[PDB]
């Protein structure tokens, strides 16, 4: 009886989405997680929820990686990928009761995934990548839903003119930023006494700027800037910026392992401009008062670059709040009417899986879960994806007029990594432990 | 069999709630129907409040009020 | 007890138990069921009503499903199993919507909203048969297909002609008022299915009072009495009192005056056939040989009234109130035996288009004859519905698949909470033909949606399903047609069943 | 062999059932054979060596 | 549904496995004993008597016994092969459902398999229109196989001669009314007499004549009323009268003046059988004189056999009748002797109407499996598996007879497959020596109509079980 | 006696059903995770990788893994086909033992069956005395069947041009040594398995019809051998043929098609002529393997026929196991 394992992988993956679904959207519900040390935490970010779940079942272990895969490809809608895969398997149980094979469902979803991107292409609005005004509106609109939403209008353009490392220290404020063509470090030049060097040559351990008690004194006699205490993350960036290479031996120190720089001084950060080497690099100087503010400031720009990366691959924009999802659930129902075999009943179940996203956002928005999605189906049938769910006001409104936009890559990648992962579960007959 | 005070009133309060819950969904023209069966097995489907209470025959005194 | 979300979840599964059992007995390839009667008797059949009639179930939710059959058999009859499959199939999808958070009232109304869309689509694809001209050619051939889903297919052709003529004789096609009370179904063991007869009148399993009587009465004279022509006796015992030969010789002449009076009274009034309740003795039958007048004996209780309607006779209590008007009318009365069996039923034939016929079924088995009673009564529903509406839609799953798309296409045009009910009513109608393919032993889904492309991509008219193991689909060429009134009632009576269960959310009994 | 159906086990019950009747009267063989006791439910006890009455 | 399909098959498998041991000539015995009665103890090996007496509470298994009664009442032989062959067909069918096979799909291939199986019996059906001497040799092989595994297995050489002799004495229709069976005490199983003038098993009167010429057979206040009813008989002008009840001596003596032989206490068969033999009529009512058909009999002789007077007729219309006189020690042996005789005359009467015969002893059954497996060359996919199961069921028929006889069933039966495939459609299992031999050489065969009827009833009885999927139990009253 | 017999049959059936899912082009995936190493969780569908890492404790099953590994080293493809044919034999053979059939008699019936089974392969195999364009075109069918049920379904036909032409340029014996990371690990593995089968076809141009055609033809000959054999040996031939019939029955179920109809129809097809019909895994129907262009190597099918049959003769003969004290 191979149904004993296919039924368990579904219920195991179903329990993960049934929990985290309440944290969907900005107006989602928080959670109360108890850690092994005894303390607890209050956070709604889904990336931290599943990371602390410590799952054991293989079906649920794939959902943790499913969320991490979206974080690298698109970077937005991390929780939306687990909810779709959770709702798809919920519909698959209705199919297995009918006597359908799992492999038949896999190739049927290949057609739904093929027609799934098509529905988003006709509704999406292409845009120009070179137009920075569209890059600023597309970036600043989505940035309002982040934690630091008040200082989003000033952190967005710093990612525009840079397109990339982000330096941050305490003191100052968020509004002030500066783009460095070269590189900047979070270290100091102690215990050197010069602190200002023109005609600099850099070589990672002739060389005037050393990026690593008797050695502190002898290195000062020749007037050589000594900079030590550098972690490995900076070694990968300085090599591509100025063209340096590591020197692991004193005899290996030669002219072929050095660099060059028109200016390398500590204005306490090490502003080193004038790379004068072939490459593509930039460093953004960020300031802030508290430590919790600068950490969120990095995520503000780092999440902003995910939207810039989404516009480069997919030069198109789509409505938010589940607006294009209604068109995806309606048009696939019509395509199934012309199909035959076991593909029609499977494409229909694939559309019902997407109906829960706006129903869940309707729940987290306080509206009725049914009257919200049922009214949008006709608004999209007769209209388009302009109308949708507006969570800021708590009602149905024109999402394009409400200044809410997301790129085409976010919704596309959320469905590809989700459907492909469900097919991996359908291709599992049983699991055995080894040693 | 006797009891008085604060908790005795709660027994009559929570007992009357069960009678209302039995005919809560019958108010209005589009109200739900209810099925009652006698010893002869005759099932009566209706949403009339007076016919429901006439056949329930609750032994509790507070419900008889 | 059971209130809120958990109320209908136990009622739906209580109703699904009747659907999942009977969903396999749908179609010509339906799996039969084993009956364990209360008296230990055992039978096997495939009729939907006979299953529900024997299902002694105590669950009240399922008890109301039997009440639907009392009114559906008189109108539909043949599709008794399909209505319950759709009743359970709709409740299956309803449980998916109850978990979403919709009240049962909006679901009961949404199905009534979708049921009218399907009835609207049935009238469109319906094709006339006898429009502006009456004919018996396709009426009998369509009845031959009604009997094809049973074991009586061996001699279905002769049985279809007798059923069609039985309706046209007592009922008129133009008037469109067919009475089932005028058509009685009789049956005796002996013979085969092709040995069926049609008696334009009524027949009772009773012989004459003497073998020397005339076996053929051509006159239109039938005397219907409860007291036969003989010395009067009560219903239990005469008990003539005799002490010795003194009373034996005086009472014999008293009856002698009675034997000569009442026997001669049959000729004074003009009667020929004497249908009496109680039997005659040998003394009374000796004088009937000289009078040349037959008579029936031991006529049962309800057998008296069955003759007064067809022949137009009257029930007379005594021989004193006999007259000419109280005689029955018939064309030819005869006595027909069966090989060596002493049944000798009273064959009364009107020899004309009378308002009462009787179909006498023969066969070498009583259970096959009983199976022919229902297979014939179902044909009357196809004949009666065709008379009321000559239009018809091709059954065998073609209507429901065509009706589902018409409903699914109309679901987008309703911005209301009943939209999900319109989408679920469409998927529930697809389960009736999906059961026909599963009972045929084929892949149900691959056999199901293959017809969807045929009714959309290939051509707009609806095509059938290869259910009878024929060459291919498009059963219009195979002459498998269902009634238009039945398809409208199968979808209508099914919504009424769901409308009665969704509005009940609590059961109470002391 | 697997031998799910066990009709041979039914034969051993038929052997051991008949084996007990012979083993009981086995010692009363011949004139010099042992005697057997027959006690009735009412308490009537009798001892004899007739092979037929046993 | 899951529990219901197994209850119908497992319930039917138990009835088949119950009486499968009685199959073949060397079948096993079976003890029958009702609870609470010591006199009801009995042991037998007749499959028809086992299932008829045992009760069954399962309804799915009840119909298997009911269809067997049709084979016993009509054919009288092969009743065990019906329930047996219907059983193993269900054993494999239960295994097919585990292979994702529908019950309706299995009936589709079986209906095609019965044609390939019925045609195989027809192709091997050897007709005998001429050579009445050899046709007489054929009737002994069908009679000898009917009495196999019965009480009369030891004296089969004597009863087979009296059975086939009665067939040749008839030489016409298969009406068994002309063949009378007398049950009388005394004599062994080999002491059975035979007569050709329709000998009767009834004595009559006190002083009646043992010889009469030109007899007319008419079948049908104490001293004043009985005399009146005798006057009702003399008006017909007869010399022999039969009555269903006993006749009193006073009206019996009035017949002595005219010479009417008074036959008294006639049973049901005594009135019906003589209606065709003596050419008379039933005439249950004899009130009206000269309105019934009077018989004709030249000599009504009387031969005392079994220490009881027996009435012997002669010179009757269509006098091909006869009487097989059975003799035994007690009534329990006469009960077993009468049933095996009449059951033998049933299939023998079928052979006079249809002289076609096939090779038995497991020869015809294996040929049915080859024609069906040959039918698998031209068939759709799913039906190929259904016909495979119907073939393995027919192959297991002699597998049970070999096990009942103790021989290695895996060798003798599986060898017939290689024997019948490449010609040689006559090899069968020789039960005497326990080997394989040609049926035409040994002279063993059965009727073609009996092998065809069990083949149809077994395919039909199983057709009803496969169509059942769910059992419904109402309230017992 | 009885305790040790089931440890061998049921101990092997569990290994047969273990890899029942990876059979065919649409073979299912398999999850594996060792003890103590949580990061070792992976997913695959290759039979040679499934059994090699799974630890075996039942001694009767250890020989089945070692005997099947010879298919992985010498042939490089079809290792899963060996275990399925073996387990299906022992499953039906367990029912023969219930019918009072000795295991030694079944082995004698299989040696006679392997003779007729090999005679069917030679009659169906197609040599190439000329028409190298037809041989090289048919080599793509050999390379097309080996890369089935892999991650390279996107460029499946692209890699067939790489392995086929690679051996034409070497012009030597079967030594193949003279010629993210997971994408390259699967590509180099299947490349070695495709070139090893190609070396045998260039040495032996004989090739048989694939897609379940060669398996059913071997069954029809053995079924015909059942009528040319003594009694007790005939039943062993029926069970050997029933296992070959179930070889494509598993590929159909793993492909989601109705295995009761498509696979069972090839029996009636091959019974009376028509020794070309096979299953179409793309369309899901029955067609001519010669027209569609599907074929496999004859040397490989003969190896799986002998290897799976030889692996079964050892496990079927043994019915008692001796276990010493662990060191």
Curated annotation (Swiss-Prot), chain A:
It comes from the Eukaryota. GO terms for cellular component: cell body; cell projection; centrosome; chaperonin-containing T-complex; cytosol; extracellular exosome; melanosome; microtubule. Pfam families: Cpn60_TCP1. One of its GO terms (biological process) is scaRNA localization to Cajal body. It is an enzyme of class 3 (hydrolase). ATP binds at residues 25, 77-78, 146. The modification N6-acetyllysine is found at residues 221, 228. Mg(2+) binds at residue 76. ADP binds at residues 25, 77-80, 144-146, 321, 406. It is found in: Cytoplasm; Melanosome; Cytoplasm, Cytoskeleton, Microtubule organizing center, Centrosome; Cytoplasm, Cytoskeleton, Cilium basal body. The modification Phosphoserine is found at residues 8, 156, 340. The keyword Chaperone applies. One of its GO terms (molecular function) is ATP-dependent protein folding chaperone. Component of the chaperonin-containing T-complex (TRiC), a molecular chaperone complex that assists the folding of actin, tubulin and other proteins upon ATP hydrolysis. The TRiC complex mediates the folding of WRAP53/TCAB1, thereby regulating telomere maintenance. As part of the TRiC complex may play a role in the assembly of BBSome, a complex involved in ciliogenesis regulating transports vesicles to the cilia. Belongs to the TCP-1 chaperonin family. It is linked to De novo genetic variants in nearly every subunit of the TRiC complex, including CCT4, have been found in individuals with a broad spectrum of brain malformations, and clinical phenotypes ranging from mild to severe epilepsy, developmental delay, intellectual disability, ataxia, and other features of cerebral malfunction. This is T-complex protein 1 subunit delta. The gene is CCT4.
Swiss-Prot record, chain B:
It is found in: Cytoplasm. The modification N6-acetyllysine is found at residue 54. ADP binds at residue 28. It comes from the Eukaryota. ATP binds at residue 28. Disulfide bonds: none annotated. Transmembrane segments: none annotated. It is linked to De novo genetic variants in nearly every subunit of the TRiC complex, including CCT7, have been found in individuals with a broad spectrum of brain malformations, and clinical phenotypes ranging from mild to severe epilepsy, developmental delay, intellectual disability, ataxia, and other features of cerebral malfunction. Component of the chaperonin-containing T-complex (TRiC), a hexadecamer composed of two identical back-to-back stacked rings enclosing a protein folding chamber. Each ring is made up of eight different subunits: TCP1/CCT1, CCT2, CCT3, CCT4, CCT5, CCT6A/CCT6, CCT7, CCT8. Interacts with PACRG. Interacts with DLEC1. Component of the chaperonin-containing T-complex (TRiC), a molecular chaperone complex that assists the folding of actin, tubulin and other proteins upon ATP hydrolysis. The TRiC complex mediates the folding of WRAP53/TCAB1, thereby regulating telomere maintenance. This is T-complex protein 1 subunit eta. It comes from Homo sapiens (Human). The gene is CCT7.
Swiss-Prot record, chain D:
ADP binds at residue 30. The modification Phosphoserine is found at residue 13. ATP binds at residue 30. It is found in: Cytoplasm; Melanosome; Cytoplasm, Cytoskeleton, Microtubule organizing center, Centrosome; Cytoplasm, Cytoskeleton, Cilium basal body. It is linked to De novo genetic variants in nearly every subunit of the TRiC complex, including CCT4, have been found in individuals with a broad spectrum of brain malformations, and clinical phenotypes ranging from mild to severe epilepsy, developmental delay, intellectual disability, ataxia, and other features of cerebral malfunction. Component of the chaperonin-containing T-complex (TRiC), a hexadecamer composed of two identical back-to-back stacked rings enclosing a protein folding chamber. Each ring is made up of eight different subunits: TCP1/CCT1, CCT2, CCT3, CCT4, CCT5, CCT6A/CCT6, CCT7, CCT8. Interacts with PACRG. Interacts with DNAAF4. Interacts with DLEC1. Belongs to the TCP-1 chaperonin family. This is T-complex protein 1 subunit delta. The gene is CCT4. The chain holds residues 24 to 77 of 539 of the full protein.
Swiss-Prot record, chain E:
Mg(2+) binds at residue 77. The modification N6-acetyllysine is found at residues 134, 161. One of its GO terms (cellular component) is azurophil granule lumen. Keywords: Acetylation, ATP-binding, Chaperone, Cytoplasm, Hydrolase, Isopeptide bond, Nucleotide-binding, Phosphoprotein, Ubl conjugation. The modification Phosphoserine is found at residue 40. Its main location: cytoplasm. Its EC number is 3.6.1.-. InterPro entries: Chap_CCT_beta (IPR012716), Chaperone_TCP-1 (IPR017998), Chaperonin_TCP-1_CS (IPR002194), Cpn60/GroEL/TCP-1 (IPR002423), GroEL-like_apical_dom_sf (IPR027409), GROEL-like_equatorial_sf (IPR027413), TCP-1-like_intermed_sf (IPR027410), TCP-1_chaperonin (IPR053374). ATP binds at residues 24, 78-80, 446, 451. It comes from the Eukaryota. Component of the chaperonin-containing T-complex (TRiC), a molecular chaperone complex that assists the folding of actin, tubulin and other proteins upon ATP hydrolysis. The TRiC complex mediates the folding of WRAP53/TCAB1, thereby regulating telomere maintenance. As part of the TRiC complex may play a role in the assembly of BBSome, a complex involved in ciliogenesis regulating transports vesicles to the cilia. Component of the chaperonin-containing T-complex (TRiC), a hexadecamer composed of two identical back-to-back stacked rings enclosing a protein folding chamber. Each ring is made up of eight different subunits: TCP1/CCT1, CCT2, CCT3, CCT4, CCT5, CCT6A/CCT6, CCT7, CCT8. Interacts with PACRG. Interacts with FLCN. Interacts with DLEC1. Interacts with SVEP1.
């Amino acid at each position: 009886k191979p149904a004993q394992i296919r039924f368990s992988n579904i219920s195991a993956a179903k329990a993960v989405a049934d929990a985290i679904r309440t944290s969907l959207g900005p107006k989602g519900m928080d959670k109360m997680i108890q850690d092994g040390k005894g303390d607890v935490t209050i956070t709604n970010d889904g990336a931290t929820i599943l990371k602390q779940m410590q799952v054991l079942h293989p079906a649920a272990r794939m959902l943790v990686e499913l969320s991490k895969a979206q974080d690298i490809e698109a970077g937005d809608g991390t929780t939306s990928v687990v909810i779709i895969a959770g709702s798809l398997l919920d519909s698959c149980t209705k199919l297995l009761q009918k006597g359908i094979h799992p492999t038949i469902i896999s190739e049927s979803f290949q057609k739904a995934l093929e027609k799934g991107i098509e529905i988003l292409t006709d509704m999406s609005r292409p845009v120009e990548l070179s137009d920075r005004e569209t890059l600023l509106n597309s970036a600043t609109t989505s940035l309002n839903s982040k934690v630091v939403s008040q200082y989003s209008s000033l952190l967005s353009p710093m990612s525009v003119n840079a397109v990339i490392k982000i330096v941050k220290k305490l003191g100052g404020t968020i509004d002030d930023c500066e783009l460095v063509e070269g590189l900047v470090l979070t270290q100091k030049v102690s215990n050197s006494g010069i602190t200002r060097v023109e005609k600099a040559k850099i070589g990672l351990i002739g060389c005037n700027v050393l990026l690593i008690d008797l050695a502190l004194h002898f290195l000062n006699k020749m007037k050589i800037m000594v900079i030590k205490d550098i972690e490995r993350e900076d070694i990968e960036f300085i090599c591509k910026t100025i063209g340096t290479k590591p020197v692991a031996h004193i005899d290996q120190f030669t002219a072929d392992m050095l660099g060059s720089a028109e200016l390398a001084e500590e204005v306490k950060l090490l502003k080193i401009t004038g790379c004068a080497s072939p490459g593509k690099t930039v460093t953004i100087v960020v300031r802030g008062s508290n430590k919790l503010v600068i950490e969120e400031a990095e995520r503000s720009i780092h999440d902003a670059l995910c939207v810039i990366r989404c516009l480069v691959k997919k030069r198109a924009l789509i409505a938010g709040g589940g607006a294009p999802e209604i068109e995806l659930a309606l048009r696939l129902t019509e395509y199934s009417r012309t199909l035959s075999g076991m593909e029609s009943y499977c494409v229909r179940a694939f559309a019902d899986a997407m109906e829960v996203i706006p129903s869940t956002l309707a729940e987290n928005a306080g509206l009725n879960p049914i009257s919200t999605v049922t009214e949008l189906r006709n608004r999209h049938a007769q209209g388009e994806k302009t109308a949708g769910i507006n969570v800021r006001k708590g009602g149905i409104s024109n999402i394009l007029e409400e200044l809410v936009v997301q790129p085409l890559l976010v919704s596309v990648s959320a469905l590809t990594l989700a459907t492909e992962t469900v097919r991996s579960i359908l291709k599992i007959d049983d699991v055995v432990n080894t040693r | 069999d006797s009891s008085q005070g604060i908790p005795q009133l709660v027994s009559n309060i929570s007992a009357c709630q069960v009678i209302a819950e039995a005919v809560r969904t019958t108010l209005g023209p589009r109200g739900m129907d209810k099925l009652i069966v006698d010893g002869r097995g005759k099932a009566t489907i209706s949403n009339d409040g007076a016919t429901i209470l006439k056949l329930l025959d609750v032994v509790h005194p507070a419900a008889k009020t | 007890r059971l209130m809120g979300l958990e109320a209908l979840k136990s009622h739906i599964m209580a109703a699904k138990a009747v659907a999942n059992t009977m969903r396999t007995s749908l179609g010509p390839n339906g799996l039969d069921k084993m009956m364990v009667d209360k008296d230990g008797d055992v039978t096997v059949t495939n009729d939907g009503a006979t299953i529900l009639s024997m299902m002694d179930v105590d669950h009240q939710i399922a008890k109301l499903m039997v009440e639907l059959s009392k009114s559906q058999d008189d109108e539909i009859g043949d599709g008794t199993t399909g209505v319950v499959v759709l009743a359970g199939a709709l409740l299956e999808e309803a449980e998916q919507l109850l978990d979403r958070g919709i009240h049962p009232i909006r679901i009961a109304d949404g199905y009534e909203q979708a049921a009218r869309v399907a009835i609207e689509h049935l009238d469109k694809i319906s094709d006339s048969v006898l429009v502006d001209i009456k004919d018996t050619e396709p009426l009998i051939q369509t009845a031959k297909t009604t009997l094809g889903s049973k074991v009586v297919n061996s001699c279905h052709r002769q049985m279809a002609e007798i059923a069609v003529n039985a309706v046209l004789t007592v009922a008129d096609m133009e008037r469109r008022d067919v009475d089932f009370e005028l058509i009685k179904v009789e049956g005796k063991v002996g013979g085969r299915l092709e040995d069926t007869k049609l008696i334009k009148g009524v027949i009772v399993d009773k012989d004459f009072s003497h073998p020397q009587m005339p076996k053929k009465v051509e006159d239109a004279k039938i005397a219907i009495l409860t007291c036969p022509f003989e010395p009067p006796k009560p219903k239990t015992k005469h008990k003539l009192d005799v002490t010795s030969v003194e009373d034996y010789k005086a009472l014999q002449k008293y009856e002698k005056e009675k034997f000569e009076e009442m026997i001669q009274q049959i000729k004074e009034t003009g009667a020929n056939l004497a249908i009496c309740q109680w039997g005659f003795d040998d003394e009374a039958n000796h004088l009937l040989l000289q009078n040349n007048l037959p008579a029936v004996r031991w006529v049962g209780g309800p057998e008296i009234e069955l003759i007064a309607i067809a022949t137009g006779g009257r029930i007379v209590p005594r021989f004193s109130e006999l007259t000419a008007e109280k005689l029955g009318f018939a064309g030819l009365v005869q006595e027909i035996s069966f090989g060596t069996t002493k049944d000798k039923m009273l064959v009364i034939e009107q020899c004309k288009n009378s308002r009462a016929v009787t179909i006498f079924i023969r066969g070498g088995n009583k259970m096959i004859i009983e199976e022919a009673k229902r297979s014939l009564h179902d044909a009357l529903c196809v004949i009666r519905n065709l008379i009321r509406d000559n239009r018809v839609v091709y059954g065998g799953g073609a209507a429901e698949i065509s009706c589902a798309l018409a409903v699914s296409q109309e679901a987008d045009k309703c911005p209301t909470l009943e939209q999900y009910a319109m989408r679920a009513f469409a998927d529930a109608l697809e389960v009736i033909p999906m059961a026909l393919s599963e009972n045929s032993g084929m892949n149900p889904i691959q056999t199901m949606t293959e017809v969807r492309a045929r009714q959309v991509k290939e051509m707009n008219p609806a095509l059938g399903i290869d259910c009878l193991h024929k060459g291919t689909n498009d059963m219009k060429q195979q002459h498998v047609i269902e009634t238009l009134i039945g398809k409208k009632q199968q979808i209508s009576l099914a919504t009424q069943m769901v409308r009665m269960i969704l509005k009940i959310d609590d059961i109470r009994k002391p | 062999y697997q031998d799910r159906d066990k009709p041979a086990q039914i034969r051993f019950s038929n052997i051991s059932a008949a084996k007990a009747v012979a083993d009981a009267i086995r010692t009363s063989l011949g004139p010099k054979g042992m005697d057997k006791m027959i006690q009735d439910g009412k308490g009537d006890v009798t001892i004899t060596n007739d092979g037929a009455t046993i | 549904a899951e529990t219901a399909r197994l209850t119908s098959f497992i319930g039917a498998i138990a009835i088949g496995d119950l009486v499968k041991s009685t199959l073949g000539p060397k079948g096993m015995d079976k003890i029958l004993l009702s609870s609470g009665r010591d006199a009801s103890l009995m042991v037998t090996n007749d499959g028809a008597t086992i299932l008829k007496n045992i009760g069954v509470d399962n309804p799915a298994a009840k119909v298997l016994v009911d269809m067997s009664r049709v084979q016993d009442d009509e054919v009288g032989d092969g009743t065990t092969s019906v329930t047996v062959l219907a059983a193993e067909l269900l054993r494999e069918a239960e295994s097919l459902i585990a292979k994702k096979i529908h019950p309706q799909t299995i009936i589709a291939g079986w209906r095609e398999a019965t044609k390939a199986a019925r045609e195989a019996l027809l192709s091997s059906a050897v007709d005998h229109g001429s050579d009445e001497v050899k046709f007489r040799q054929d009737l002994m092989n069908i009679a000898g196989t009917t009495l196999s595994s019965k009480l009369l297995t030891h004296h089969k050489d004597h009863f087979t001669k009296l059975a086939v002799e009665a067939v040749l004495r008839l030489k016409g229709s298969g009406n068994l009314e002309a063949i009378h069976i007398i049950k009388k005490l005394g004599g062994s199983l080999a002491d059975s007499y035979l007569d050709e003038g329709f000998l009767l098993d009834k004595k009559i009167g006190v002083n009646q004549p043992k010889r009469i010429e030109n007899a007319k057979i008419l079948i049908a206040a104490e001293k004043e009323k009985m005399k009146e009813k005798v006057e009702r008989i003399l008006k017909h002008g007869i010399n022999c009268f039969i009555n269903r009840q006993l006749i009193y001596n006073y009206p019996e003596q009035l017949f002595g003046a005219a010479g009417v032989m008074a036959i008294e206490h006639a049973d049901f068969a005594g009135v019906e059988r003589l209606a065709l033999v003596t050419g008379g009529e039933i005439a249950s009512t004899f009130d009206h004189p000269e309105l019934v058909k009077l018989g004709s009999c030249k000599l009504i002789e009387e031969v005392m056999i079994g220490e009881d007077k027996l009435i012997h007729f002669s010179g009757v219309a269509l006098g091909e009748a006869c009487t097989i006189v059975l003799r035994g020690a007690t009534q329990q042996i006469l009960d077993e002797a009468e049933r095996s005789l009449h059951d033998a005359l049933c299939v023998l009467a079928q052979t006079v109407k249809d002289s076609r015969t096939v090779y038995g002893g497991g020869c015809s059954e294996m040929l049915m499996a080859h024609a069906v497996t040959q039918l698998a060359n031209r068939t759709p996919g799913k039906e190929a598996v259904a016909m495979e199961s119907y073939a393995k069921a027919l192959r297991m028929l002699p597998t049970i007879i070999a096990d009942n006889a103790g021989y290695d069933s895996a060798d003798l039966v599986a060898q017939l497959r290689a024997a019948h495939s490449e010609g040689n459609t006559t090899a069968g299992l020789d039960m005497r020596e326990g080997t394989i031999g040609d049926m035409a050489i040994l002279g063993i065969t059965e009727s073609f109509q009996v092998k065809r009827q069990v083949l149809l009833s077994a395919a039909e009885a199983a057709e009803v079980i496969l169509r059942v999927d769910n059992i419904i139990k109402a309230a017992p009253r």
